[PDB]
Amino acid sequence: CPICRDHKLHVDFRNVKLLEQFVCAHTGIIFHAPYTGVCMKQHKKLTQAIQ
Amino acid sequence: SFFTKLTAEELWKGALAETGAGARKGKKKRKDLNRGQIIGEGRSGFLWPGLNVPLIKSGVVQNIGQRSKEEQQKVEATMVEQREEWDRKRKIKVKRERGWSGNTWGGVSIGPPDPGPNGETYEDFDTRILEVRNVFNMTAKEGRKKSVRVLVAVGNGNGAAGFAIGKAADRGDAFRKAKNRAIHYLHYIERYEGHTIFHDISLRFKRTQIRMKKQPRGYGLRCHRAIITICRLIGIKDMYARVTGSMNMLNLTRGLFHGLARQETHQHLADKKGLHVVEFREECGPLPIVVASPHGALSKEPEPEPEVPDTKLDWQDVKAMQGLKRSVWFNLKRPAT
Amino acid sequence: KNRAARVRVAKGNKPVSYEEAHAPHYIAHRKGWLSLHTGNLDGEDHAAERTLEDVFLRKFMMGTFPGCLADQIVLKRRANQVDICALVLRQLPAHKFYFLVGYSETLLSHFYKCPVRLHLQTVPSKVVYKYI
RNA sequence: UUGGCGGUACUUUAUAUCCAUCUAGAGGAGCCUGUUCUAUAAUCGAUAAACCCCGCUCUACCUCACCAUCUCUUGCUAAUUCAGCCUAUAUACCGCCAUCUUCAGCAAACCCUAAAAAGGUAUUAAAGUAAGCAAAAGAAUCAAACAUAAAAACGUUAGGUCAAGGUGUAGCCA
Numbered sequence: 293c294p295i296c297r298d299h300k301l302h303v304d305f306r307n308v309k310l311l312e313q314f315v316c317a318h319t320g321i322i323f324h325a326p327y328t329g330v331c332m333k334q335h336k337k338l339t340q341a342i343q
Numbered sequence: 344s345f346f347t348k349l350t351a352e353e354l355w356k357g358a359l360a361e362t363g364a365g366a367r368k369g370k371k372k373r374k375d376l377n378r379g380q381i382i383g384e385g386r387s388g389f390l391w392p393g394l395n396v397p398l399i400k401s402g403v404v405q406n407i408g409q410r411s412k413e414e415q416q417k418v419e420a421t422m423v424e425q426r427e428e429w430d431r432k433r434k435i436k437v438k439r440e441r442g443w444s445g446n447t448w449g450g451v452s453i454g455p456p457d458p459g460p461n462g463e464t465y466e467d468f469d470t471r472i473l474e475v476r477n478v479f480n481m482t483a484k485e486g487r488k489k490s491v492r493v494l495v496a497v498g499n500g501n502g503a504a505g506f507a508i509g510k511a512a513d514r515g516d517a518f519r520k521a522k523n524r525a526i527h528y529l530h531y532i533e534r535y536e537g538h539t540i541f542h543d544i545s546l547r548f549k550r551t552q553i554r555m556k557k558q559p560r561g562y563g564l565r566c567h568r569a570i571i572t573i574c575r576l577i578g579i580k581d582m583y584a585r586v587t588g589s590m591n592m593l594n595l596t597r598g599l600f601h602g603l604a605r606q607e608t609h610q611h612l613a614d615k616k617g618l619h620v621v622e623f624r625e626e627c628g629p630l631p632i633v634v635a636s637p638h639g640a641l642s643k644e645p646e647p648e649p650e651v652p653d654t655k656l657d658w659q660d661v662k663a664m665q666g667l668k669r670s671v672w673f674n675l676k677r678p679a680t
Numbered sequence: 681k682n683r684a685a686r687v688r689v690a691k692g693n694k695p696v697s698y699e700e701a702h703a704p705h706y707i708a709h710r711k712g713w714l715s716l717h718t719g720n721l722d723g724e725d726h727a728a729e730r731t732l733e734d735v736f737l738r739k740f741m742m743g744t745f746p747g748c749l750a751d752q753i754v755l756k757r758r759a760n761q762v763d764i765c766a767l768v769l770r771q772l773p774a775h776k777f778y779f780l781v782g783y784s785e786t787l788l789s790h791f792y793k794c795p796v797r798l799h800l801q802t803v804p805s806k807v808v809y810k811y812i
Numbered sequence: 813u814u815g816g817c818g819g820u821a822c823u824u825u826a827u828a829u830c831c832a833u834c835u836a837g838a839g840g841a842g843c844c845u846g847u848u849c850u851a852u853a854a855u856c857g858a859u860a861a862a863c864c865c866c867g868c869u870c871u872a873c874c875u876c877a878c879c880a881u882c883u884c885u886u887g888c889u890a891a892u893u894c895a896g897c898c899u900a901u902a903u904a905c906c907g908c909c910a911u912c913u914u915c916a917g918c919a920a921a922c923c924c925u926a927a928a929a930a931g932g933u934a935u936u937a938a939a940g941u942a943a944g945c946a947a948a949a950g951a952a953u954c955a956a957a958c959a960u961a962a963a964a965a966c967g968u969u970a971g972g973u974c975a976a977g978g979u980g981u982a983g984c985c986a
C-alpha cells in the first residue's frame with residue numbers, strides 16, 4: 293500500500309504534512325481505507341495519529 | 344562445400360516459414376547472429392593491429408599476436424554472458440497502466456495526438472480509449488476481411504475535449520486515425536468553478552439515458568467508468584451520473600458531449616432573465632453570494648415564484664428522499680477517482 | 681507467375697534499390713551488368729573460370745565487410761587486372777577500412793595470381809530508388 | 813446491413829473459339845517413345861484441366877539415387893564426442909515454377925457523413941482528394957509500321973519440386 297511501499301514515510305502525529313493528505317480538505321473527514329488503498333493496519337494507525 | 348552456403352537473410356526466411364500456404368490460411372522466432380560480433384574477432388583469438396586492437400600502444404607500433412588459452416576462454420565466457428544478458432533484456436519491459444480491466448483497451452492512455460501541419464504540438468492533450476472492436480467482413484482479399492474500429496477521446500483537462508472513431512485493418516493505424524481526428528472536433532465544456540457542471544443534466548440520446556448531477560467539492564466522480572475517463576479529460580472533478588437503457592459506448596459518448604456542451608452558465612442565465620444570480624451555501628449560512636450579474640440593465644420585476652411547481656421529477660431521484668431502502672450496491676466504498 | 685530475381689510488392693514500406701527494383705528482363709535495357717569480362721564474347725575462352733572466380737569474389741567481400749556493403753559489388757577485368765568497386769556504408773572507422781583493403785587485396789592477389797585492387801565509395805546510408 | 817452460391821440456364825459476349833465453316837491429322841497397320849498394368853532380387857519424383865519424348869538439351873560401364881554379394885569404421889575439411897546421411901514430412905519453408913492470364917484489378921495516406929454494421933457519383937457536375945502497384949507507355953526482333961516475343965499485380969489450387977541446392981523439426985552413427 294502507499295504507506296507500506298515507502299518505508300521512509302512515517303505515520304506520526306507530528307508529521308502533519310503526511311497526515312493532511314489523508315484528510316479531506318473541504319469536509320475535513322478522514323478518508324476510508326478503500327479511498328486511498330492503505331491497509332487496515334495503517335489506516336487505523338493513521339486515524340489515531342490524525343486524532 | 345563453400346559454394347552452397349547462403350546468406351543469413353535467406354536462411355531465416357526459409358526457417359521462419361512466414362510466407363507459406365499454411366501461414367496465410369492457417370513458435371519460430373528470428374535471431375540476429377551478428378549482433379555481438381566485433382570485426383576482427385575469431386575463435387583462435389588472434390589480435391590484429393588496426394582491426395580489433397589498438398594500432399599503436401604507448402607509442403609502440405603493435406604487431407600481430409594471439410591470446411592465450413586462458414585469456415581466450417575468458418573472452419568467450421564474457422560474450423556468452425553478454426548474450427545471456429541480452430536475452431534477459433528482451434524479456435524485460437516497462438509495464439504500462441491497464442484500463443478498466445487487464446485484458447481490455449478501454450481506459451488506456453495512448454499519448455497525445457501527432458503534431459499538426461505547422462508544428463502545432465499537442466503535448467498538453469491526453470488520449471484515452473473507450474471501445475475497440477475487431478470486426479470481420481466478407482471481401483475477396485481474405486474471404487472474410489479484418490477490420491478494427493476504435494473509439495477514442497482526447498482532452499487537455501482544462502475544458503477542451505473531443506472524441507472520434509478511427510477504422511483500419513491494423514489496430515495501430517486505427518489509433519492514429521481516431522487520435523488525430525478527435526483533435527479536430529474539440530468541444531469546450533463549461534465547468535462551474537472548474538470542478539463541476541453548472542446544473543443538473545438529464546438527456547436521452549437514442550436509447551441511452553444519462554442523468555448527471557452537480558455536486559460539491561470533495562464529492563469525486565461517481566459515474567460510469569467511461570464517464571470518469573471523459574470527465575478527467577474535460578477537467579470535471581466532482582459529479583454524479585447514472586446511465587440506463589442501452590450501454591452503447593458511442594451513444595454514451597455522443598450523448599455525454601451533447602449534454603455537457605449545451606449547458607447554461609450562470610452568466611448566461613443572468614443575461615437571459617436580467618436578474619442577479621445569487622448562491623446560498625449551507626456551510627456559509629444565510630450569506631448571499633453573488634455569482635453573476637446581468638451585463639446590461641438590471642430588471643425590477645421579480646421572477647414569478649409559483650406556489651407549486653410543475654417540474655417533471657424522476658422517480659429515481661425522489662425515491663431516495665421518500666425513505667425507500669436503496670440497493671446493496673449503492674454508495675459502496677470505492678477507490679478515489 | 682515468375683519468381684526469379686523479383687523483389688515482390690509489400691504494402692509500400694519496403695525500400696528497394698535501383699538494382700533490386702528491376703526484374704531480369706530489364707537487363708541490358710535499364711540496368712547494366714555487374715561483372716564485365718571478355719569471356720562471354722563470341723569466340724572467347726575461359727567463361728567457366730571467370731564465372732567461378734566472380735562467385736567467390738562476391739562471397740569473400742561480403743564476409744570481409746560484413747554489414748558494410750550498401751549494394752552489390754562491381755567487378756571489372758582489364759588485361760590480367762581485377763578491380764572490385766563496392767559501395768560501403770560508413771559504419772566502420774576509417775582506419776579499419778585501410779586494414780581490410782590491404783588484407784583483402786593481398787589475399788586475393790596471391791589466390792588468383794593477378795593484380796587485384798579495391799575501390800570503395802562510401803555512402804552515408806543505402807540509396808533507395810523506390811518504396812514498394 | 814452485407815457476403816455468398818443456387819438452376820444465375822436470361823440479354824450481349826469467345827474469335828483459331830462453345831456449335832458451324834475450312835485444312836492436315838489422331839482414332840486402324842508397322843515400329844519409335846512415355847505412362848499404367850502385369851511382373852522383377854532391383855530406383856525415386858511427376859501422374860484430371862495445369863501428368864504421360866515429364867525432371868532427361870539424353871540410363872551399354874560411369875551416370876546411380878535401385879538390387880545381390882564382399883569389404884571399410886575419425887570415414888574429403890584448419891579444428892570439432894566429430895565426418896557423413898538422395899533418411900520421413902513440399903501439410904514447416906527458401907529457391908524456381910504450373911494455373912486462371914496478356915484476366916483487370918490491387919489500392920496506402922488524408923478528407924466528409926444528424927454515426928459510419930458502411931458509403932463517398934452527377935461534367936450545363938451534387939464530397940471527395942493528392943500519390944503508388946499492374947495495365948498502358950517504353951525497350952527487343954538492328955528504317956518505318958503491324959505482328960511476334962517479352963511483360964502480366966493480388967489471390968485460386970496446403971497445385972509441383974526435401975532427389976538442383978539450402979534449410980526447420982524428427983530419425984541413423986559397426
Ligand SMILES: [K+]
Nearest residue numbers: 902905907973
Ligand atoms: K514452394
Ligand SMILES: [Mg+2]
Nearest residue numbers: 441444445446
Ligand atoms: Mg489479468
Ligand SMILES: [Mg+2]
Nearest residue numbers: 857858902972
Ligand atoms: Mg508428391
Ligand SMILES: [Mg+2]
Nearest residue numbers: 873874875876
Ligand atoms: Mg549402371
Ligand SMILES: [Mg+2]
Nearest residue numbers: 873874875876
Ligand atoms: Mg555400379
Ligand SMILES: [Mg+2]
Nearest residue numbers: 877897898899
Ligand atoms: Mg543411401
Ligand SMILES: [Mg+2]
Nearest residue numbers: 950951952957
Ligand atoms: Mg516498339
Ligand SMILES: [Mg+2]
Nearest residue numbers: 947948949963
Ligand atoms: Mg506493357
